[PDB]
C-alpha cells in the first residue's frame, strides 16, 4: 500500500533482472525451470523464460510485453536490457522510499537523462560505408559468435546480406524487406545452398526444373529475391532462422544507423563515465537522482565480469578510468574479462542497438514509477 | 546472493550414480523393475531403467532423458556415461565452491574435450575387415555378451551373433539393420538351449497333423486369393477341386520322377481341412492367416511371388529352399525354413521359461549384433578393458611447457578432467570387492615401465583375478564411433548441469 | 543377519568441521573479532584462542578435545591457533576422497607421521640463523609489527611496536635471561583512549594520599619501606602519641642523614595501613610524600625494583633501606592516585600502562600485549628465525611433491596419505587471501609461478605472500617472521589432533550419571 506497494514492485523486477544477468554474451549461462506440472525448460534465452513463467507479481507482468517489443527489433542481446529498468528501481531506494523524492521529479530527471543519453550515443558514433561486402560480413557475424555455426556462417550469412540489399535500396532509404520468401529444405549438408535472383514460383537465360522431395523449381524473370536453405540436420532449421532470418535486424539497423558503437556490452562504459560529468554541470535538486543513473549504468557491464569470474569492484576501477580519460573507444573483453579495447576486438554494433535499449528502458521505468499501489480482487 | 543452488541440485543428482554404481562392468548385477500389474523385467539397459524409475528430484529426471541418444551411439553399457559425469561434477565442487567461477572451469573441460579426440586419434587401432577373420569376430562378441550374460550363455550366443553378422555383409560394406528383424520368442526348455536359425520362421501352421515334418526341397509360393470359398452349395466345393487340380498338375510338372521335392502354400484366409487330405499324398504344405509383413519378407528371401489366380502357374515365380522342417510345440505349429533362394536374412530362435528370462537375451543380441556391425562399418577399434581410462588421463596430466593450452583456473580444469576419467576403472574393481589403489600399481605403473622400453603397449584390467591383462588376448574391444560421441557427448550433457546457475520453481499456474 | 557394524563418513565429521568455517573468518590480520556477552551486559570482544574454545559453548563434543589440545598451543604460541584447526578441516574432506574408496583410516595415519619427520628435515634448512646478542632492533620491530597487525589495527601497531621491543629488552641480557613470572604488572583502568597508552620502566602503585599539598612531579625520592603505620588511633591517648612522635623524629633524622636539604634529593614513605591526615601536615612542611593503604604484593616488589630493603619496625633505619628513582610522578584519576616510579638505575621489571574506556577495548589490548610480548620473547630464545608470510607452508608442499618414491619410497598405500597432507598446507595461505578480498586460487597461482623460477635461478631465496598487492614478495622486506618454537609444536600438534579425529569410526552414549 502506497510506498510499501512500490517496494514489492522494485523487488519484483529486481528478482527477474538478476536471473537474466548471466544471459548476455558468448559466456552466457543457462537457467533451469520447474513448473507445477513437472516439466523442465533449460535454455539461455530469456524470451521463452518470461513466457512460460506465470509471475504472481503484477509489476513483473509488464516486463513480458516489453520483451516482445525488444525482441521485435533485434531479439539477440536485447533481453538483458530489462536489467537497466530494474537497476533504476533499485537506485530509487535511497531516494524514493527514503528521501521521499516525488516520482515525476525522477521522471523529469529521466527525461533529461534520456536526452543527454542520445547526445552520448552521437559521441560514440562511428559511421561506416555499407557498399563494402567484407565490412558488412564481419558485422552480421557479431551475433554468430554465440553459436557453433561460426565456421558454417561462411556459406550462410552471405545469402542474407545479398537478399536484403535487393529489397532495401532507397525510396529516405525506408523500404519493406518483408517481400523476401525463405524456403527451408530438411536434410543434407549445410554447405549446400541455392543462389537465385528473381521470383520463385524478358530475354530469360534458361528454364529448368530440379529434383527436390519438397517441391519443384520454377524461375520467373522480372524487369524481389528468394532464399532456399538446405539444413545440415533435421531440427537444425530452427537455429538456422535465428542466425539468418532473425539476423536480418543487423542489415536493417546498419541501413537506418550506419554508425557503430562498441559491441559486447562495451558501449555503456563510456556512457556511465560521461553521464557523471554531465551531472556536475546541472547544479540543481534533480542532480542527485540524475547522477545516480550512472550508478545504474555500471551494473550492466558487471554481468560480463560475473560471467568472466572477475571482481567487478577492482576491475572496473581501471576500466572506468580508460573511458573517462584516454578515449571512449575502449571496451571490455567478455570472454576472459580483459582490458583489450574494441579496436582489436573486431566487433561493433549499430547505435540504434543502445538507442532502442535506453529509450524502451526509460519509458518502461517511468510507467512503473507512476503506479502508486496495486489492488486485487475486483472480479472483472 | 550468488546461487548456492548448484551444490543442492547436484547433491540430489549424486544419488543417481550411487544407484548405477553397481551397473558397470561384467561383474555388475542386473536391476529389476516391477509394475502394479505384476509384470517384472530384469535388465541393465539404461533406457528402460531410467524411464520406469521416477526420481523425486526433477534435476536427475531431465538428465536421464539425454540417455535416449546413446542408443545409436553406444547401446551397451550406457551407464559409463552417467557414472563418468557423476564424479566430473564432484571434482567441480572442490573448485567452484572455493570461489572458482563455473564458466572459467567449463572452458577448461571444453579444451580437453576436443584435445581428447586428438589423443584418441593416435590411440585407436585399425584392423582389416575384408578378411572376415573369425579370431577378431569372436572377441567383439565377448566384449558384449560377457558384459550382458554369464559365461554359460557366452559360448552359446557367441556363434549365433557371429553367424548373424556374417550373414549380412558385402565387399562394398553394405549393411542394413532392417534386413534382420524377426526374432522368435518362445517359452520352453531353458535360455541356454537357444539356437541360430538360418532362415525366416513363421508363427502359424496347418491344421493337418499328418503333414510331412521334414522336406528336402520346398517351393514357396504366395497365394493371394483364398483357396477355400467364402460365400456365393454343391457348386461352391467344385470350384475348390478345380483349383486343387492346378496344384496337382503343377506338382507333377516340375518334378515327375522322385518325390524328393515339395510345395508350400501361403493363404491369407482359412483352408478346409477336408481339402488338406489330398496334400498328404503329394506332401504339400499349406498355411493360413498369414500376415502381410510376413509375406513381404518371403519374396526377398524364399524368392516366391504373390499369385492371384491358380489357373496360371509357372516355375519362374516359384522360389526354393535347401532345408525345410516343421515342429509342433503345444497347440501352435511352427515351420522352420532355412537355406532359401536369398539366405542373407536369418532369425534367432530364443526359448526359455517365461518372459522374465527372455528379456535378457532379446536386448543382448539386438544391440550386440549392431555393436559388431560397427566393427565392419568402422575398421578403427578402441582397446577396451579400461586401457584408455589411464592413457587419456596420463596425456593431460603431464603438460609443463610442452603442450598445455590453458592458464590459471583453466589449467586446473584439465587436471580435474584427468582425475574424472579414473572413477570408472576404480568402480569396476569396487563392484567385485577389490582395492583400486593396488590395481593401479600393477596396471597404471606398468605403462610407465613399457614406455621406457620404446614400445607401444596397451594394458587392460582383469576383473577375474584383479590384475592386469591384455585387451588383445582377452578380446575386449570397442568401436571408435561408439566412444567418440560418448566421451564428447558426456561433456555436453554434464555441461547442462554446469551451465545451470540455480533451479527456480515457477511456470504455468 | 550380520551387516550392522558402522560406516565412517561425514556424520563423525559434522562435529569436527563445525569450527572450521567459524574459525576461518578470524584467521589472519584481515580477520574479524568475536564477542562474548553475558546477562549483565559485559562484552569481551577478541578473536584470541582463549575465547574461541574454552569460553565458547557448543553442543559439539569434539570442541572439548580441541579446547584441551589448545592448552599447549596457547602456552607455547597463543597466536594463530585457528591455523591448526583449518588443517584438520581440510583433511576431513580428504577422507571422502580416499577413505570412501576403501582405504583404511590407519593407512593415511602413516603419511602424517612420515610428514612430521620430513617437515623437520625441511624446517632445518628453511630456518635462518640470527645472533640475538647484538641487540638488533631491526627484526625486533618487524616481529612485533607482524604480531600487532594480526591483533590490533595499524594505529595501535605504530605505538605499541617500539614499546614491546624495549619492554622485553630490559630484562634481556647477554645471558638471554627473560623471566615473565616475576614481571607482569598489568594495570587495568579506564582512561582516555587505547591509542594514548604509554610505557613505564618501573612499578606503578595504585594508592596515594589525599592531602592536597602532596607533590605530584618529583625529581627523585628515597623509598622507605614500612610494614607498620604510625597514626592517631582510639587507644591514655598520649601514650600512643609518644611512640609515634618519637619515631617521627627518626624519620626526619633519616632525611638529614641523606642530606634531604638538597633540592636534588627527595624523600618518601609508604605504609600498609591508613595515615592520620593530621600527621600529613608535618610531611607537607618538609615536602615529604606519604602513601597509605599499600598492598602486601606491591610492598614486596619495591625491594627488587627501587633497590632498597624491606623494613618492618621504624626503630631500625639504615641508608641501605632507602631506594633510588630517577623520575617520580603522581597522577590523580578518580578516587585513587597513581604514583609513577621510573628511570631507576637498574630496573628489574617494567610495565605497559593500559588506556581505554569500554570493557571490550581493554580486553582486546589486554591479551594482545601479553601475546605480542610472548611472541617476541621466543625470538630472543630462538637463535633461528623462521620466514613467515606463508613461505613455510607453500614451499613445504612443493618439497613433498618433488620427492615421493625417490627418497621415502612409498609402496603406493601411503602415497595418498603423504599427498593429502600437502593439500592442507596451502589452506593456511588460502584463507589469508580470502580475507583480503582477492581470489584465493589466482593469487596462490602467481606465487607458485615464482617458486618455479626460483628453482631454476640457482640461488637461495624465499617467496613471500603480500595480501595488499596480491603478488609475491620477500619475507625480509615484508617483515613477517616466526619464531622457531612457534612452528615446532604447531606442526607436531597438528599431526596429533588430526589423527585422533580420523581414527574414530563410531560413537556411542553410555556411562554413569
Swiss-Prot record, chain A:
Keywords: Acetylation, ATP-binding, Chaperone, Cytoplasm, Disulfide bond, Nucleotide-binding, Phosphoprotein. Disulfide bonds join 223-225. CDD domains: TCP1_gamma. InterPro entries: Chap_CCT_gamma, Chaperone_TCP-1, Chaperonin_TCP-1_CS, Cpn60/GroEL/TCP-1, GroEL-like_apical_dom_sf, GROEL-like_equatorial_sf, TCP-1-like_intermed_sf, TCP-1_chaperonin. Its main location: cytoplasm. It is found in: Cytoplasm. Belongs to the TCP-1 chaperonin family. Molecular chaperone; assists the folding of proteins upon ATP hydrolysis. Known to play a role, in vitro, in the folding of actin and tubulin. In yeast may play a role in mitotic spindle formation. PANTHER family: CHAPERONIN. Heterooligomeric complex of about 850 to 900 kDa that forms two stacked rings, 12 to 16 nm in diameter. This is T-complex protein 1 subunit gamma. It comes from Saccharomyces cerevisiae (strain ATCC 204508 / S288c).
From Swiss-Prot, chain B:
Pfam families: Cpn60_TCP1 (PF00118). It comes from the Eukaryota. InterPro entries: Chap_CCT_zeta (IPR012722), Chaperone_TCP-1 (IPR017998), Chaperonin_TCP-1_CS (IPR002194), Cpn60/GroEL/TCP-1 (IPR002423), GroEL-like_apical_dom_sf (IPR027409), GROEL-like_equatorial_sf (IPR027413), TCP-1-like_intermed_sf (IPR027410). The keyword Hydrolase does not apply. It is found in: Cytoplasm. GO terms for cellular component: chaperonin-containing T-complex. Molecular chaperone; assists the folding of proteins upon ATP hydrolysis. Known to play a role, in vitro, in the folding of actin and tubulin. In yeast may play a role in mitotic spindle formation. Heterooligomeric complex of about 850 to 900 kDa that forms two stacked rings, 12 to 16 nm in diameter. This is T-complex protein 1 subunit zeta. It comes from Saccharomyces cerevisiae (strain ATCC 204508 / S288c). The gene is CCT6.
Amino acid at each position: 500500500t502506497g510506498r510499501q506497494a512500490q517496494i514489492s514492485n522494485i523487488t519484483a523486477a529486481k528478482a527477474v533482472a538478476d536471473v537474466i544477468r548471466t544471459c548476455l554474451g558468448p559466456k552466457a549461462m543457462l537457467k533451469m525451470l520447474l513448473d507445477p506440472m513437472g516439466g523442465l525448460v533449460l535454455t539461455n534465452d530469456g524470451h521463452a523464460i518470461l513466457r512460460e513463467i506465470d509471475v504472481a507479481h503484477p509489476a513483473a507482468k509488464s516486463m513480458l510485453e516489453l520483451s516482445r517489443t525488444q525482441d521485435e527489433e533485434v531479439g539477440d542481446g536485447t533481453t538483458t536490457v530489462i536489467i537497466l529498468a530494474g537497476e533504476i528501481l533499485a537506485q530509487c531506494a535511497p531516494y524514493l522510499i527514503e528521501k521521499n523524492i516525488h516520482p515525476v521529479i525522477i521522471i523529469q530527471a529521466l527525461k533529461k537523462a534520456l536526452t543527454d543519453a542520445l547526445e552520448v550515443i552521437k559521441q560514440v558514433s562511428k559511421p561506416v560505408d555499407v557498399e563494402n561486402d567484407a565490412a558488412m560480413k564481419k558485422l552480421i557475424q557479431a551475433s554468430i559468435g554465440t553459436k557453433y555455426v561460426i565456421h558454417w556462417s561462411e556459406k550462410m550469412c552471405e545469402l542474407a546480406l545479398d537478399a536484403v540489399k535487393t529489397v532495401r535500396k532507397d525510396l529516405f532509404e525506408i523500404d519493406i524487406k518483408r517481400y523476401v520468401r525463405v524456403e527451408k529444405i530438411p536434410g543434407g549438408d549445410v554447405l549446400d545452398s541455392r543462389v537465385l535472383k528473381g521470383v520463385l514460383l524478358t530475354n530469360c537465360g534458361l528454364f529448368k526444373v530440379e529434383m527436390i522431395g519438397d517441391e519443384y523449381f520454377s524461375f520467373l524473370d522480372n524487369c524481389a529475391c528468394t532464399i532456399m536453405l538446405r539444413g545440415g540436420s533435421k531440427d537444425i532449421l530452427n537455429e538456422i532462422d535465428r542466425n539468418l532470418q532473425d539476423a536480418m535486424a543487423v542489415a536493417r539497423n546498419v541501413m537506418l544507423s550506419p554508425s557503430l558503437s562498441p559491441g559486447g556490452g562495451a558501449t555503456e562504459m563510456a556512457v556511465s563515465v560521461k553521464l557523471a560529468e554531465k551531472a556536475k554541470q546541472l547544479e540543481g535538486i534533480q542532480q542527485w537522482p540524475y547522477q545516480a543513473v550512472a550508478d545504474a549504468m555500471e551494473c550492466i557491464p558487471r554481468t560480463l565480469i560475473q560471467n568472466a569470474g572477475g571482481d567487478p569492484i577492482r576491475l572496473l576501477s581501471q576500466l572506468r578510468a580508460k573511458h573517462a580519460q584516454g578515449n571512449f573507444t575502449t571496451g571490455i573483453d567478455g570472454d576472459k574479462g580483459k582490458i583489450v579495447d574494441m579496436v582489436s576486438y573486431g566487433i561493433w554494433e549499430p547505435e540504434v542497438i543502445k538507442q532502442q535499449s535506453v529509450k524502451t528502458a526509460i519509458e518502461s521505468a517511468c510507467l512503473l514509477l507512476r503506479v502508486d499501489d496495486i489492488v486485487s480482487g475486483v472480479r472483472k | 546472493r550468488r546461487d548456492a543452488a548448484l551444490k543442492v541440485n547436484v547433491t540430489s543428482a549424486e544419488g543417481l550414480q550411487s544407484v548405477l554404481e553397481t551397473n558397470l562392468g561384467p561383474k555388475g548385477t542386473l536391476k529389476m523393475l516391477v509394475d502394479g500389474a505384476g509384470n517384472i523385467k530384469l535388465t541393465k539397459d539404461g533406457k528402460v531403467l531410467l524411464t520406469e524409475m521416477q526420481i523425486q528430484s526433477p534435476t536427475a529426471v531431465l538428465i536421464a532423458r539425454a540417455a535416449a541418444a546413446q542408443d545409436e551411439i553406444t547401446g551397451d553399457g550406457t551407464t559409463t556415461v552417467v557414472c563418468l559425469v557423476g564424479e566430473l561434477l564432484r571434482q567441480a565442487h572442490r573448485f567452484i565452491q572455493e570461489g572458482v567461477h563455473p564458466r572459467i572451469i567449463t572452458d577448461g573441460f571444453e579444451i580437453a574435450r576436443k584435445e581428447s579426440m586428438k589423443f584418441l586419434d593416435e590411440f585407436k587401432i585399425s584392423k582389416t575387415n575384408l578378411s572376415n577373420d573369425r579370431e577378431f569376430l569372436l572377441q567383439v562378441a565377448r566384449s558384449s555378451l560377457l558384459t550382458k550374460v554369464d559365461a554359460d550363455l557366452t559360448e552359446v550366443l557367441t556363434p549365433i551373433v557371429t553367424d548373424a553378422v556374417l550373414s549380412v555383409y558385402d565387399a562394398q560394406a553394405d549393411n542394413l539393420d532392417l534386413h534382420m528383424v524377426e526374432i522368435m520368442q518362445m517359452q520352453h526348455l531353458s535360455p541356454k538351449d537357444t539356437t541360430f536359425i538360418k532362415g525366416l520362421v513363421l508363427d502359424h501352421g496347418g491344421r493337418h497333423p499328418d503333414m510331412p515334418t521334414r522336406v528336402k526341397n520346398a517351393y514357396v509360393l504366395i497365394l493371394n486369393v483364398s483357396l477355400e470359398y467364402e460365400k456365393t452349395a454343391a457348386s461352391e466345393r467344385k470350384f475348390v477341386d478345380a483349383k486343387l487340380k492346378k496344384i496337382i498338375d503343377l506338382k507333377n510338372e516340375v518334378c515327375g520322377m522322385d518325390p524328393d521335392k515339395g510345395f508350400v502354400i501361403i493363404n491369407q484366409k482359412g483352408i478346409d481341412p477336408m481339402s488338406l487330405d489330398v496334400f498328404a499324398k503329394h506332401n504339400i504344405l499349406a498355411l493360413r492367416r498369414a500376415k502381410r509383413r510376413n509375406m513381404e519378407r518371403l519374396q526377398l528371401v524364399t524368392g516366391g511371388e504373390a499369385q492371384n489366380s491358380v489357373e496360371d502357374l509357372s516355375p519362374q515365380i516359384l522360389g526354393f529352399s535347401g532345408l525345410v522342417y516343421q515342429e509342433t510345440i503345444g497347440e501352435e505349429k511352427f515351420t522352420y525354413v532355412t537355406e532359401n533362394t536369398d539366405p542373407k536374412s536369418c532369425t534367432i530362435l530364443i526359448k526359455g521359461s517365461t518372459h522374465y528370462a527372455l528379456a535378457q537375451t532379446k536386448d543382448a543380441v539386438r544391440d550386440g549384433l549392431r555393436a559388431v556391425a560397427n566393427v565392419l562399418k568402422d575398421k578403427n577399434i578402441i582397446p577396451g578393458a579400461g586401457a584408455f581410462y589411464i592413457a587419456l588421463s596420463r596425456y593431460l596430466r603431464s603438460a609443463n611447457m610442452n603442450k598445455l593450452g590453458a592458464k590459471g583456473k583453466t589449467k586446473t580444469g584439465i587436471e580435474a578432467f584427468a582425475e574424472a576419467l579414473l572413477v570408472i576403472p576404480k568402480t569396476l574393481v569396487k563392484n567385485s570387492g577389490f582395492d583400486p589403489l593396488d590395481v593401479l600399481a600393477m596396471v597404471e605403473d606398468e605403462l610407465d615401465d613399457a614406455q621406457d622400453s620404446d614400445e607401444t603397449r596397451y594394458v587392460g584390467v582383469d576383473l577375474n583375478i584383479g590384475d592386469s591383462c591384455d585387451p588383445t588376448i582377452e578380446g575386449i574391444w570397442d568401436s571408435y564411433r561408439v566412444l567418440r560421441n560418448a566421451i564428447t557427448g558426456a561433456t555436453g550433457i554434464a555441461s547442462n548441469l554446469l551451465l545451470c546457475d540455480e533451479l527456480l520453481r515457477a511456470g504455468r499456474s
